[PDB]
Design a protein around this ligand. Structure first.
Ligand SMILES: O=C(O)c1ccc2nc(N3C[C@H]4CCC[C@@H](C3)[C@@H]4OCc3c(-c4c(Cl)cccc4Cl)noc3C3CC3)sc2c1
Lengths: 229, 11
């Protein structure tokens, strides 16, 4: 059973999620540009600033977001930006999106000044995620439920976020029975991988500082959402 | 902080 409320809700989210595409002229740079450490970082920076914009536009459409406390609206974006960005790339690597150019994207990530410490677990995570064999609807809902985490730092009205989140967890919960009655513990596996995804918040802050002390800079938008000083 | 996030939120 999937409630009618939950079917419309779900298709509405697929609207937002499908609508989130970044232009080809931008993503073609993953394949097109020279491969050197400096160009690799530049391109990752550019895919990221572009992606953040798309992120915001997706979050905006999330039902009831536009009627949240403004201060909390920001606390969520900053809170979820990394986790959401890691899921998007997980989808690219696992689903082999043409426009993601995954093999070349991996080459660029592997030579952009990131410590092995972080590369190893990052790719372990992507591998595990793929093994869940998630649909596009699941990637989409997880991103939605990640953005609307009520446990982020500096949220005032926690319960008001719970209310926006709980329905999406419910819909995902169902999809996990309905699109996989074979494996029972599928939904729980997803949630565990979310915990695993949380650990990348700390890695990413060290990644940023390493980059910065080696005189890389980001964009003003990234600098805001990632809190670069 | 906020400035550019705000700006994207309003559109
Ligand atoms: O819709 C598409 O077609 C499409 C295609 C490709 C594509 N690549 C995307 N990326 C590539 C990259 C992989 C993670 C998500 C970020 C956006 C972008 O982040 C790079 C990144 C990360 C990062 C990495 Cl390397 C892995 C995972 C998550 C992050 Cl935030 N940290 O810093 C940076 C920039 C150097 C400052 S979004 C996207 C959409």
């Amino acid at each position: 059973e999937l409630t009618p409320d939950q079917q419309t809700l779900l298709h509405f989210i697929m609207d937002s999620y499908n609508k989130q595409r970044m232009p080809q002229e931008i993503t073609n740079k993953i394949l097109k540009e020279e491969f050197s450490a400096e160009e690799n970082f530049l391109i990752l920076t550019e895919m990221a600033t572009n992606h953040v914009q798309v992120l915001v536009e997706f979050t905006k459409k999330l039902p009831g977001f536009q009627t949240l406390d403004h201060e909390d609206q920001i606390a969520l974006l900053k809170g979820s930006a990394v986790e959401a960005m890691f899921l998007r790339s997980a989808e690219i690597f696992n689903k082999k999106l043409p426009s993601g150019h995954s093999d070349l994207l991996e080459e660029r990530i592997r030579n952009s000044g990131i410590s092995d410490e972080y590369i190893t677990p990052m790719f372990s995570f992507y591998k595990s995620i793929g093994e869940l064999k998630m649909t596009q609807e699941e990637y989409a809902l997880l991103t939605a439920i990640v953005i609307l985490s009520p446990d982020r730092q500096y949220i005032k009205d926690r319960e008001a976020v719970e209310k926006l989140q709980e329905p999406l967890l419910d819909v995902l919960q169902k999809l996990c029975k309905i699109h996989q009655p074979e494996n029972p513990q599928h939904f729980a596996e997803l949630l565990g991988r979310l915990t695993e995804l949380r650990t990348f918040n700390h890695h990413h802050a060290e990644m940023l500082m390493s980059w910065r002390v080696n005189d890389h800079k980001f964009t003003p938008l990234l600098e805001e959402i990632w809190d670069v000083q | 902080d906020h400035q550019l996030l705000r700006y994207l939120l309003d559109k």
